[PDB]
Short mmCIF file of all heavy atoms in Angstrom, two decimals:
data_model
loop_
_atom_site.label_atom_id
_atom_site.label_comp_id
_atom_site.label_asym_id
_atom_site.label_seq_id
_atom_site.Cartn_x
_atom_site.Cartn_y
_atom_site.Cartn_z
N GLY A 1 32.01 54.24 5.12
CA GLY A 1 30.87 53.70 4.40
C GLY A 1 31.25 52.54 3.49
O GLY A 1 30.80 52.46 2.35
N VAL A 2 32.09 51.65 4.00
CA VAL A 2 32.54 50.49 3.23
C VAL A 2 32.38 49.20 4.02
O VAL A 2 33.02 49.01 5.05
CB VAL A 2 34.01 50.64 2.80
CG1 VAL A 2 34.39 49.54 1.82
CG2 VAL A 2 34.25 52.01 2.18
N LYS A 3 31.51 48.32 3.54
CA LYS A 3 31.27 47.04 4.21
C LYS A 3 32.55 46.23 4.32
O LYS A 3 33.43 46.30 3.46
CB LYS A 3 30.21 46.24 3.45
CG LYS A 3 28.79 46.56 3.87
CD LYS A 3 28.33 47.90 3.33
CE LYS A 3 26.91 48.23 3.76
NZ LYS A 3 25.90 47.56 2.90
N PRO A 4 32.67 45.45 5.40
CA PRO A 4 33.84 44.61 5.65
C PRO A 4 33.94 43.44 4.67
O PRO A 4 34.97 42.78 4.58
CB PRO A 4 33.62 44.10 7.07
CG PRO A 4 32.14 44.15 7.27
CD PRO A 4 31.66 45.32 6.47
N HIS A 5 32.85 43.19 3.95
CA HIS A 5 32.81 42.11 2.98
C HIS A 5 33.41 42.55 1.64
O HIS A 5 33.61 41.73 0.74
CB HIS A 5 31.37 41.63 2.77
CG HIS A 5 30.53 42.59 1.98
ND1 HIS A 5 29.50 43.32 2.53
CD2 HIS A 5 30.58 42.93 0.67
CE1 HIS A 5 28.95 44.07 1.59
NE2 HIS A 5 29.58 43.85 0.46
N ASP A 6 33.69 43.84 1.52
CA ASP A 6 34.27 44.39 0.30
C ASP A 6 35.59 45.08 0.58
O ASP A 6 36.08 45.87 -0.22
CB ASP A 6 33.29 45.37 -0.35
CG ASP A 6 32.31 44.68 -1.29
OD1 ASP A 6 32.65 43.60 -1.81
OD2 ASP A 6 31.21 45.23 -1.50
N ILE A 7 36.18 44.77 1.74
CA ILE A 7 37.45 45.37 2.13
C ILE A 7 38.58 44.35 2.05
O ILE A 7 38.38 43.16 2.29
CB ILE A 7 37.39 45.93 3.56
CG1 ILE A 7 36.50 47.18 3.61
CG2 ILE A 7 38.79 46.25 4.07
CD1 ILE A 7 36.18 47.65 5.01
N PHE A 8 39.77 44.83 1.70
CA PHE A 8 40.94 43.96 1.58
C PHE A 8 41.61 43.77 2.94
O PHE A 8 41.32 44.49 3.89
CB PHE A 8 41.93 44.54 0.58
CG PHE A 8 42.46 45.89 0.97
CD1 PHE A 8 43.43 46.01 1.94
CD2 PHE A 8 41.97 47.04 0.36
CE1 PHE A 8 43.92 47.26 2.30
CE2 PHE A 8 42.46 48.28 0.71
CZ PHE A 8 43.43 48.39 1.69
N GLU A 9 42.52 42.80 3.01
CA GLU A 9 43.24 42.52 4.25
C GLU A 9 44.62 43.17 4.24
O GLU A 9 45.15 43.49 3.18
CB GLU A 9 43.37 41.01 4.46
CG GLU A 9 42.17 40.38 5.13
CD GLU A 9 42.51 39.07 5.83
OE1 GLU A 9 42.88 39.12 7.02
OE2 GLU A 9 42.40 38.01 5.18
N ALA A 10 45.19 43.35 5.42
CA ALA A 10 46.51 43.96 5.55
C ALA A 10 47.55 43.19 4.73
O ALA A 10 48.48 43.78 4.18
CB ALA A 10 46.93 44.02 7.01
N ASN A 11 47.38 41.87 4.66
CA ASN A 11 48.31 41.02 3.92
C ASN A 11 48.07 41.15 2.42
O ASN A 11 49.00 41.05 1.62
CB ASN A 11 48.15 39.56 4.35
CG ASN A 11 48.00 39.42 5.85
OD1 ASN A 11 48.56 40.19 6.62
ND2 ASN A 11 47.23 38.42 6.28
N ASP A 12 46.81 41.37 2.04
CA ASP A 12 46.45 41.51 0.63
C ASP A 12 47.27 42.61 -0.03
O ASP A 12 47.78 42.44 -1.14
CB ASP A 12 44.96 41.81 0.49
CG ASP A 12 44.10 40.57 0.63
OD1 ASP A 12 44.54 39.62 1.30
OD2 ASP A 12 42.99 40.56 0.06
N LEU A 13 47.41 43.74 0.65
CA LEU A 13 48.17 44.87 0.13
C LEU A 13 49.64 44.76 0.52
O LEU A 13 50.53 45.02 -0.29
CB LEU A 13 47.58 46.18 0.65
CG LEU A 13 48.04 47.45 -0.07
CD1 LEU A 13 47.58 47.45 -1.52
CD2 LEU A 13 47.53 48.69 0.65
N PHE A 14 49.88 44.39 1.77
CA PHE A 14 51.25 44.25 2.27
C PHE A 14 51.98 43.11 1.56
O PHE A 14 53.02 43.32 0.94
CB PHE A 14 51.24 43.99 3.78
CG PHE A 14 52.57 44.24 4.44
CD1 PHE A 14 53.22 45.45 4.27
CD2 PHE A 14 53.16 43.26 5.22
CE1 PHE A 14 54.45 45.67 4.88
CE2 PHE A 14 54.38 43.48 5.83
CZ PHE A 14 55.02 44.69 5.66
N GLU A 15 51.42 41.91 1.65
CA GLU A 15 52.02 40.74 1.02
C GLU A 15 51.60 40.64 -0.45
O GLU A 15 51.85 39.64 -1.11
CB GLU A 15 51.61 39.47 1.76
CG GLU A 15 52.26 39.33 3.13
CD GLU A 15 52.46 37.88 3.54
OE1 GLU A 15 51.54 37.30 4.15
OE2 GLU A 15 53.54 37.33 3.24
N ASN A 16 50.95 41.69 -0.94
CA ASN A 16 50.49 41.73 -2.32
C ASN A 16 49.96 40.36 -2.76
O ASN A 16 50.00 40.01 -3.94
CB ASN A 16 51.63 42.16 -3.25
CG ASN A 16 52.95 41.49 -2.90
OD1 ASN A 16 53.56 41.80 -1.87
ND2 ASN A 16 53.39 40.57 -3.75
N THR A 17 49.46 39.59 -1.79
CA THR A 17 48.93 38.27 -2.07
C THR A 17 47.67 38.35 -2.92
O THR A 17 47.26 37.37 -3.54
CB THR A 17 48.60 37.51 -0.77
OG1 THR A 17 48.14 36.19 -1.08
CG2 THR A 17 47.54 38.25 0.04
N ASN A 18 47.05 39.53 -2.95
CA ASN A 18 45.84 39.75 -3.73
C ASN A 18 45.73 41.20 -4.18
O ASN A 18 45.72 42.12 -3.35
CB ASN A 18 44.61 39.36 -2.90
CG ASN A 18 43.45 38.90 -3.77
OD1 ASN A 18 43.43 39.14 -4.98
ND2 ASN A 18 42.49 38.22 -3.16
N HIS A 19 45.64 41.40 -5.49
CA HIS A 19 45.53 42.75 -6.05
C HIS A 19 44.07 43.13 -6.26
O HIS A 19 43.63 44.21 -5.87
CB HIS A 19 46.30 42.84 -7.37
CG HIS A 19 47.77 42.61 -7.22
ND1 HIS A 19 48.67 42.86 -8.24
CD2 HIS A 19 48.50 42.16 -6.18
CE1 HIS A 19 49.89 42.57 -7.82
NE2 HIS A 19 49.81 42.14 -6.57
N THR A 20 43.32 42.23 -6.89
CA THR A 20 41.91 42.47 -7.16
C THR A 20 41.15 42.79 -5.88
O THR A 20 40.34 43.72 -5.84
CB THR A 20 41.25 41.25 -7.84
OG1 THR A 20 40.92 40.26 -6.87
CG2 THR A 20 42.17 40.66 -8.89
N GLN A 21 41.41 42.02 -4.83
CA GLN A 21 40.75 42.22 -3.55
C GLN A 21 40.87 43.67 -3.10
O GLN A 21 39.93 44.24 -2.55
CB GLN A 21 41.36 41.30 -2.49
CG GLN A 21 40.52 41.19 -1.22
CD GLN A 21 39.03 41.27 -1.50
OE1 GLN A 21 38.38 40.25 -1.73
NE2 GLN A 21 38.48 42.48 -1.47
N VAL A 22 42.04 44.27 -3.34
CA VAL A 22 42.28 45.65 -2.96
C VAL A 22 41.55 46.61 -3.89
O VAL A 22 40.98 47.61 -3.45
CB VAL A 22 43.78 45.98 -2.97
CG1 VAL A 22 44.00 47.48 -2.81
CG2 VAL A 22 44.51 45.21 -1.88
N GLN A 23 41.57 46.31 -5.18
CA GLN A 23 40.91 47.14 -6.18
C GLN A 23 39.42 47.25 -5.90
O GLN A 23 38.88 48.35 -5.76
CB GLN A 23 41.14 46.57 -7.58
CG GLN A 23 41.06 47.62 -8.68
CD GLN A 23 41.05 47.01 -10.07
OE1 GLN A 23 40.32 46.05 -10.33
NE2 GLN A 23 41.86 47.56 -10.97
N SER A 24 38.75 46.10 -5.81
CA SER A 24 37.32 46.07 -5.55
C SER A 24 36.96 46.98 -4.38
O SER A 24 35.95 47.69 -4.41
CB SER A 24 36.87 44.64 -5.26
OG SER A 24 36.96 43.83 -6.41
N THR A 25 37.79 46.96 -3.35
CA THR A 25 37.57 47.78 -2.16
C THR A 25 37.44 49.26 -2.53
O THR A 25 36.53 49.95 -2.08
CB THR A 25 38.70 47.62 -1.14
OG1 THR A 25 38.77 46.25 -0.70
CG2 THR A 25 38.48 48.52 0.07
N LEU A 26 38.37 49.74 -3.36
CA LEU A 26 38.37 51.13 -3.79
C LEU A 26 37.15 51.43 -4.66
O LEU A 26 36.48 52.44 -4.49
CB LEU A 26 39.65 51.45 -4.56
CG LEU A 26 40.96 51.05 -3.87
CD1 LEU A 26 42.11 51.06 -4.86
CD2 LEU A 26 41.25 51.98 -2.70
N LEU A 27 36.88 50.53 -5.60
CA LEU A 27 35.74 50.69 -6.51
C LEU A 27 34.50 51.14 -5.74
O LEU A 27 33.70 51.93 -6.25
CB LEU A 27 35.46 49.38 -7.24
CG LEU A 27 36.53 48.91 -8.23
CD1 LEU A 27 36.08 47.65 -8.94
CD2 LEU A 27 36.84 50.01 -9.23
N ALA A 28 34.35 50.64 -4.53
CA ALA A 28 33.20 50.99 -3.69
C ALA A 28 33.42 52.34 -3.02
O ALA A 28 32.52 53.19 -3.00
CB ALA A 28 32.96 49.91 -2.65
N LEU A 29 34.60 52.54 -2.46
CA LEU A 29 34.93 53.79 -1.78
C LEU A 29 34.55 54.99 -2.64
O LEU A 29 33.89 55.92 -2.16
CB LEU A 29 36.43 53.84 -1.46
CG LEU A 29 36.86 54.90 -0.44
CD1 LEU A 29 35.89 54.94 0.73
CD2 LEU A 29 38.28 54.63 0.04
N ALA A 30 34.96 54.97 -3.90
CA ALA A 30 34.65 56.05 -4.82
C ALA A 30 33.18 56.43 -4.75
O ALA A 30 32.83 57.62 -4.74
CB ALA A 30 35.03 55.66 -6.24
N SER A 31 32.31 55.43 -4.70
CA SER A 31 30.87 55.66 -4.64
C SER A 31 30.48 56.27 -3.29
O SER A 31 29.51 57.02 -3.20
CB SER A 31 30.11 54.35 -4.86
OG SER A 31 28.85 54.59 -5.46
N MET A 32 31.24 55.93 -2.26
CA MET A 32 30.98 56.45 -0.92
C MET A 32 31.31 57.93 -0.83
O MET A 32 30.70 58.67 -0.05
CB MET A 32 31.79 55.67 0.12
CG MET A 32 31.63 54.16 0.01
SD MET A 32 29.93 53.66 -0.31
CE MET A 32 29.10 54.35 1.12
N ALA A 33 32.27 58.37 -1.63
CA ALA A 33 32.68 59.77 -1.64
C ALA A 33 31.82 60.58 -2.61
O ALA A 33 31.66 61.79 -2.45
CB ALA A 33 34.15 59.89 -2.01
N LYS A 34 31.28 59.91 -3.62
CA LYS A 34 30.44 60.56 -4.61
C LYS A 34 29.19 61.15 -3.97
O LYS A 34 28.96 62.36 -4.02
CB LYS A 34 30.04 59.57 -5.71
CG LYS A 34 31.02 59.53 -6.87
CD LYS A 34 30.49 58.68 -8.02
CE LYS A 34 31.41 58.74 -9.23
NZ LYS A 34 31.49 60.11 -9.80
N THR A 35 28.38 60.29 -3.36
CA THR A 35 27.16 60.72 -2.70
C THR A 35 27.42 61.90 -1.77
O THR A 35 26.69 62.89 -1.79
CB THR A 35 26.52 59.58 -1.89
OG1 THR A 35 25.25 59.99 -1.37
CG2 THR A 35 27.43 59.15 -0.75
N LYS A 36 28.46 61.79 -0.96
CA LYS A 36 28.82 62.85 -0.02
C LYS A 36 28.96 64.19 -0.74
O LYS A 36 28.41 65.19 -0.30
CB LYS A 36 30.14 62.50 0.69
CG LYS A 36 29.94 61.72 1.97
CD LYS A 36 29.00 60.54 1.77
CE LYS A 36 29.17 59.50 2.87
NZ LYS A 36 28.58 59.96 4.16
N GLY A 37 29.69 64.19 -1.85
CA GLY A 37 29.88 65.41 -2.61
C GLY A 37 31.34 65.67 -2.93
O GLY A 37 31.80 66.81 -2.85
N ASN A 38 32.06 64.62 -3.29
CA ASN A 38 33.48 64.74 -3.62
C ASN A 38 33.70 64.64 -5.12
O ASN A 38 32.79 64.29 -5.87
CB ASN A 38 34.29 63.66 -2.90
CG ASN A 38 34.40 63.92 -1.41
OD1 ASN A 38 35.44 64.38 -0.92
ND2 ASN A 38 33.34 63.62 -0.67
N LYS A 39 34.92 64.94 -5.56
CA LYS A 39 35.26 64.87 -6.97
C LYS A 39 35.97 63.57 -7.31
O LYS A 39 37.20 63.47 -7.21
CB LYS A 39 36.15 66.06 -7.36
CG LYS A 39 35.40 67.39 -7.39
CD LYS A 39 36.05 68.36 -8.36
CE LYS A 39 35.07 69.43 -8.81
NZ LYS A 39 34.02 68.87 -9.70
N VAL A 40 35.20 62.56 -7.70
CA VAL A 40 35.76 61.26 -8.05
C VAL A 40 35.74 61.04 -9.56
O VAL A 40 34.74 61.32 -10.22
CB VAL A 40 34.99 60.11 -7.36
CG1 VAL A 40 35.61 58.77 -7.70
CG2 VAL A 40 34.95 60.33 -5.86
N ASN A 41 36.84 60.53 -10.09
CA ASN A 41 36.95 60.27 -11.52
C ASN A 41 36.98 58.77 -11.80
O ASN A 41 37.74 58.30 -12.65
CB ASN A 41 38.21 60.93 -12.09
CG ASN A 41 38.30 62.40 -11.73
OD1 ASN A 41 38.90 62.77 -10.71
ND2 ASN A 41 37.71 63.26 -12.56
N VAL A 42 36.15 58.02 -11.09
CA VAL A 42 36.08 56.58 -11.26
C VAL A 42 34.74 56.16 -11.87
O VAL A 42 33.68 56.58 -11.41
CB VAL A 42 36.27 55.84 -9.92
CG1 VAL A 42 36.13 54.34 -10.11
CG2 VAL A 42 37.62 56.19 -9.31
N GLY A 43 34.81 55.34 -12.90
CA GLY A 43 33.60 54.87 -13.56
C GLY A 43 32.82 53.88 -12.72
O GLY A 43 32.73 52.70 -13.06
N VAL A 44 32.26 54.35 -11.61
CA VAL A 44 31.50 53.50 -10.71
C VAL A 44 30.11 54.08 -10.45
O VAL A 44 29.98 55.14 -9.84
CB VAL A 44 32.22 53.29 -9.37
CG1 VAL A 44 31.28 52.69 -8.34
CG2 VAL A 44 33.45 52.42 -9.56
N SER A 45 29.08 53.39 -10.91
CA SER A 45 27.71 53.84 -10.72
C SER A 45 26.91 52.83 -9.90
O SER A 45 26.83 51.65 -10.25
CB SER A 45 27.03 54.05 -12.08
OG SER A 45 27.55 55.19 -12.74
N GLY A 46 26.32 53.30 -8.80
CA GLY A 46 25.54 52.43 -7.95
C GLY A 46 26.31 51.20 -7.52
O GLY A 46 27.45 50.98 -7.92
N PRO A 47 25.67 50.36 -6.69
CA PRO A 47 26.29 49.12 -6.19
C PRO A 47 26.45 48.07 -7.28
O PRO A 47 25.59 47.20 -7.45
CB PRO A 47 25.30 48.64 -5.12
CG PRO A 47 23.99 49.23 -5.53
CD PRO A 47 24.31 50.55 -6.17
N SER A 48 27.55 48.16 -8.02
CA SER A 48 27.82 47.21 -9.10
C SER A 48 28.51 45.96 -8.57
O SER A 48 29.71 45.98 -8.28
CB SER A 48 28.69 47.87 -10.17
OG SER A 48 28.70 47.10 -11.36
#
């Protein structure tokens, strides 16, 4: 449940060429697990 427009690239994490790009990706994931019914401890509410 994560759009490709909010996902990081293999090089972003591998070549650490971009940190924020990877972070933003997770910020959304947390919300994807919340609705489902998981235990997330991330301050992410709705599509911010």
Side-chain angles (χ1 to χ4, degrees):
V2 189
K3 273 75 181 278
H5 73 250
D6 273 335
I7 290 169
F8 61 77
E9 275 203 89
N11 318 327
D12 280 27
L13 194 65
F14 197 54
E15 289 210 271
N16 43 289
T17 183
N18 209 343
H19 297 191
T20 80
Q21 194 34 89
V22 170
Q23 206 190 46
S24 292
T25 299
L26 309 164
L27 293 183
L29 195 43
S31 210
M32 308 319 301
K34 270 188 175 296
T35 186
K36 270 48 161 73
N38 288 258
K39 288 207 157 290
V40 182
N41 308 92
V42 177
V44 166
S45 289
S48 194

